From a paper:
More recently, Gr43a and its homologs were identified as narrowly tuned fructose receptors, and they were also found to be expressed in the brain and function as a sensor for the hemolymph fructose levels, thereby regulating the feeding behaviors. Among different sugars tested, e.g., 100 mM maltose, arabinose, glucose, trehalose, and fructose, only fructose activated DmoGr43a, with a measured EC50 of 42.97 ± 4.69 mM and ~30 mM in electrophysiology and calcium imaging respectively. Lined by S7 that spans both ICD (S7a) and TMD (S7b), a continuous ion conduction pathway in the 4-fold symmetry axis runs all the way through both DmoGr43a and DmGr64a, and are all in the non-conductive state. In both proteins, two patches of constrictions are formed along the ion conduction pathway, one near the extracellular entrance (Ile 418 and Phe 422 for DmoGr43a, and Val 438 and Gln 441 for DmGr64a) and the other in the anchor domain in ICD (Leu 386 for DmoGr43a, and Glu 399 and Phe 403 for DmGr64a). Intriguingly, the narrowest point at the extracellular entrance is formed by completely different sets of residues in DmoGr43a and DmGr64a, e.g., bulky, hydrophobic phenylalanine in DmoGr43a vs smaller, hydrophilic glutamine in DmGr64a. Notably, Arg 70 from the S1–S2 loop, which is disordered in the apo state, becomes well-resolved in the fructose-bound state, and travels downward for fructose binding. When the apo and sugar-bound structures of DmoGr43a and DmGr64a were aligned, notable conformational changes could be revealed, mainly tilting of TM helices responsible for sugar binding towards bound sugars.
While mammals use G protein-coupled receptors (GPCRs) for sweet and bitter tastant perception, insects such as fruit flies use a unique family of proteins called gustatory receptors (Grs). To unravel the overall structure of these receptors and their unique structure features that define sugar specificity, we determined the cryo-electron microscopy (cryo-EM) structures of Drosophila mojavensis Gr43a (DmoGr43a) (given its better biochemical behavior than Drosophila melanogaster Gr43a (DmGr43a)) and Drosophila melanogaster Gr64a (DmGr64a) in apo or sugar-bound states. As expected, both DmoGr43a and DmGr64a form tetramer, and are topologically similar to each other, and to Orco from Apocrypta bakeri and odorant receptor 5 from Machilis hrabei (MhOR5)11. The structures of DmoGr43a and DmGr64a can be separated into a TMD with 28 transmembranes (TMs) in total (7 TMs in each subunit, numbered as S1–S7), and an intracellular domain (ICD) containing an “anchor domain”, following the nomenclature of Orco/MhOR510,11.
Numbering used by the authors:
A (entry chain C), B (entry chain D), C (entry chain B), D (entry chain A): 1 to 161, 166 to 216, 263 to 424
The structure:
């Protein structure tokens, strides 16, 4: 993942949420270096293990209690256990990916520094820092308000329907796991959006340099080809770093969307208190936004990477210089055999098409379920 | 979208249906220009908002009425609300796409003028105008008769089963929204069919120029390559202009097809009045024709664009001139890395394959639903 | 479709089954020519219309009879009507494709003659004639015995459970339509297998000419490239000729497989007479064999066409002659941008993958249906 | 399949499990040769036929017994018969593939020897032998303990719920068929992993030779291209050898996963003895491990084969030698048109994506089934 000064605070968040057991330090001549932090690695492992144990322990006491409010019937038990276990699995996979991703992180950061060295005019450090910090703050604030509203509505329903603080305490670890999941989403989205921005800047450089002395252009094209290859390598590195984590995040999004939609439709049919309906609608919106935060950056990066070949062809059709058109032909040959789609550890390609697939499931699972009640 | 004299009347229809908030005016030396029309933009926004509010208000009064004829039971309420809301969503998305699509429209029209300047022998202005006007008139006439028949059968059923004009008045806005949807279909089909026709004309020029003095052919091949690239850019521009609108139109087609088929099968099982059966069959035919009007032009354009590479290869195998065969090799290289499939904002590729997918859903959703009644 | 002497009898069968309204006649200097036969065209149209009317009339009298044996309950009526109508639709589509496919047939036959002129050593006229006639005879014999067994078991069940010859007479037209469908399958399989055989012969020529004086090889490679392009054009011509017919044939295969499997499982659960079980098993085998007869030739042709590029690359790596390696490079360039997959009028690609898709449906439709009985 | 000294013992296992009716013998000057073993071929055919007959006979006596413990109800009969028949089908297909795969085996082994002759520095004979023998021993030990545990829990349940040794004897042949299936998995995994290892070694050679006198490098690149083509041919040979067997193995994995998950959920709902729950969980883990053992090697080989083009491009961008860059261009041209994905006899491509598809089924089949109980 990306560790840059412009979004250094992001890294700190990832370090505080048991997802970045690393330490970043400038050396003498610039050059931030990322090394393993044994203290923070131990802290992250212990925190993840303790929190998973705590949430499962709370679930087990809720099931083995003389008055349950969320376990209750067998189907409710199964749904709640599946949801909690899916979140737990996503959290554990993210912590594991951050645990053994030191070498990939250093390689990606070195490649990103090398790439950003060339694209000096298009840096926009202030704008990128502002956007990244705004995204992180917005996501954290939204998840905080949503967790507060959920706990408030749950305590309200348990109070109207008397020994509820114990259940709330048992269920707090689930909410902290949701916080960690939000942090994981923030980290992955930041890295993928950085890759997409660098691809867009490369395309803009290629467009400006030729649509709007020959040796400067020759090594410019050479550096552009090198940067495109390095960006492809960075995409592959991010895939290796976060593939299984993103796969389990997508599984979590699908499961939560289906379960929340089914519960919302059932509650609307039963015509119960509207506050739970608003809470469920907010949860649906949050899950859809999570799915978008995962899918959109990968699709944007893949689309921006594939456009470079058209600009290269247009450049080729507007060159009367032989060594530089030879370099352009080499660039076109390199781009023809190239991929930049983020792969969830090979199981699927992460782009907007995933959304369609999810719909094709979310509808089907609903059609079997929604009308089975009646 | 396309704004040309040959189908200028089409644009007027799109302007009258709150879908084209633009003004087209010739300047001095030919050259139609498209500019933003503030009056018509405000009119379109106000009309869309007022009509959506009116149809939802009619639905809400129908639900909160002492005698409902379309809301009634909970499942009927859900089906009717989903259908109306889907049409509303498609209408709103189309109006939004036309609202903020000024720059794309001007770019597409300038590119189309540049392309059509080269293909002077193959213009067929009278034929294209006749076909476009016939398509628009046929679609409007069909939707008018269908809406009249639907309102007639609904008023007949409500009269035989007494205070019905109020419900008809409440439901008129739904029919006007259907009119706007038909206009949106007409506009998109016109643009996509124009792109397909231009691709076919380019292919015919390439076939005729070589299957049936060398510098004329050299710049002819250069202009053909430029026109093919510009047509690809126009396809991408149309995708950017109408992607989300086409996606929601496809969702509308699928939902309406499934709902109408289910209702028709249920009515046939109940063996009720046959007039409603004929009305439902007409609605099914109309929805299928809408789906075809969306899918067929995109598939035709994609197929016609992909054929150019075969003609280019055949030309390459029949050339003994070195600079022009070099140009032909450049054309082949450009065509090899090229796409022209219309994408519904990246979620799916719009071609005839979509039909198959729809069947794979329409059957499944029916199998779960049709036999669940018995 | 293919009209050659080696399988001329096949054409006669297609002429007798209202599928080939053409007349083939040698001219003076060899050169069979295919022309429109007005008498046979009128005969085919009248026979198809009369037979469709007869089968639907028999179905309608069976439904409106005081004792039905196949209509009976509403679900049985729906299943029988859907099956009969699907067969009718496939028959009508095949007759329509043969009705307006004169120009495609002549073009395909001329291209096939031109191709076969080059591949003189690999002709095997006796072997191809024997195989084609054996396939046609086997298919006709199998369908005859299956229809006889089905009518025998139906008359036996109606006799044990008395005025049955009337129902048998009403249902005979369905069996004649099955005969026409078998003829359509034979025709399509013959054409596709001929295309695949020609592709294989081209590949064998390419392998033998180089793995086992230079101008002979140069024009040999030129003729091989021309023949490959012509074979691709022939595949596209067959697609244009039989796309919608093959699509409806595949729909028929899927529907019949699902319905027969469901009926067989229901009968086995009810533990009724075993003779109907054997008849249903034979029908399942026949439907699977029909699906294979449609899918396998297209997949074989597509696989054999795609292999040529590997042989061309191997030839390129073993050539020290400059004009002929230039020709080989042109051949490789032509093969790189090329497709030969049979497309069912653009809706789907016909290959073995279709089988998988069918399973993914046949299982699902069964899971919803088989366990719904219990 | 692969017959090498490093894993010669593996072959012996495949010979003892009626899957490798061959005999491997060194000739005078090295060069192991594989010939048909008539004695072992007859033994394999007889053993497979006798074992299939024995397991079906045991099933039939269990069904026609005055006290059944696994047939019982109709749905239990159907599930057990389908599972046993699926295992039988996989076993028969594997034995048939090994029966008529002599020529493919010799061709693959000769090609593998030719390839391994070039990659002399990267041999790791001890490591490969250790890994292969460890994999075989681990798989056999796991299946042995699982079969023992299953028979123990079945005899325990039948004893607590008395004439059980007869049923255990009737069901032993099913367990021996499971042993044969495990052997088939071991053989296929060994061959595919060998292909993947050779691809990885080729990539490592290409990386080392250039990232870290010119004629040596020229014939080195030539030999690398030859080895890559031969590895592709070996992948195609393995596909031809084991396609239908792998397809039926995948069908077996899907069916067993779905059935075991459904039975486990039903048992957990019924809250019966936990020992059967642990046994079912172990069976689920084993089926998932089988599916991984089939899918992972093919995906790894396909991924390692596709990476060579990037290394070739990087080499091309770092060469100032004209004949060798010409050879590199030829290598790039060969790699551009090339595939190495294992195909299950054309029906599907075997990679990690299959897993996703399986989930998309396993969920759906469960959603229809799991909640239908309640």
């Amino acid at each position: 993942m990306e560790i840059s000064e412009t979004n250094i605070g992001i890294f700190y968040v990832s370090k505080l949420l048991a997802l970045a057991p690393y330490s970043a330090k400038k050396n003498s001549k610039g050059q931030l270096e990322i090394t393993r932090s044994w203290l923070f690695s131990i802290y992250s492992v212990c925190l993840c293990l303790i929190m998973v144990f705590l949430t499962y322990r709370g679930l087990l006491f809720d099931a083995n209690s003389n008055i349950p409010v969320r376990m209750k019937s067998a189907t409710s038990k199964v749904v709640t256990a599946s949801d909690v276990s899916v979140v737990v699995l996503a959290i554990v996979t993210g912590v594991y990916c951050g645990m053994f991703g030191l070498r990939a992180t250093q390689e990606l950061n070195t490649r990103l520094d090398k790439i950003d060295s060339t694209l000096s005019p298009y840096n926009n450090v202030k704008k990128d820092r502002w956007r990244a910090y705004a995204m992180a703050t917005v996501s954290l604030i939204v998840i905080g308000i949503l967790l507060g509203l959920d706990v408030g509505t749950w305590v309200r329903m348990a109070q109207e329907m008397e020994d509820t603080e114990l259940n709330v305490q048992w269920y707090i670890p689930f909410y902290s796991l949701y916080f960690i999941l939000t942090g994981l989403h923030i980290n992955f989205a930041n890295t993928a959006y950085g890759l997409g921005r660098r691809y867009k800047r490369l395309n803009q450089m290629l467009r400006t340099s030729y649509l709007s002395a020959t040796k400067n252009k020759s090594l410019l094209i050479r550096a552009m080809a090198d940067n495109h290859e390095s960006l492809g390598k960075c995409v592959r590195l991010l895939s290796r770093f976060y593939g299984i984590a993103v796969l389990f995040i997508l599984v979590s999004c699908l499961l939560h969307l289906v379960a929340t939609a089914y519960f919302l439709f059932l509650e609307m049919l039963n015509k119960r208190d509207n506050g739970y309906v608003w809470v469920q609608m907010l949860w649906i919106i949050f899950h859809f936004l999570r799915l978008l935060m995962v899918v959109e950056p990968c699709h944007l990066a893949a689309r921006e990477a594939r456009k470079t070949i058209q600009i290269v062809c247009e450049i080729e059709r507007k060159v009367f210089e032989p060594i530089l058109v030879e370099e352009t032909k080499k660039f076109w040959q390199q781009l023809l055999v190239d991929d930049a789609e983020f792969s969830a550890s090979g199981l699927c390609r992460v782009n907007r098409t995933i959304l369609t697939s999810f719909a094709s499931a979310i509808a089907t699972y609903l059609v079997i379920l929604i009308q089975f009640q009646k």
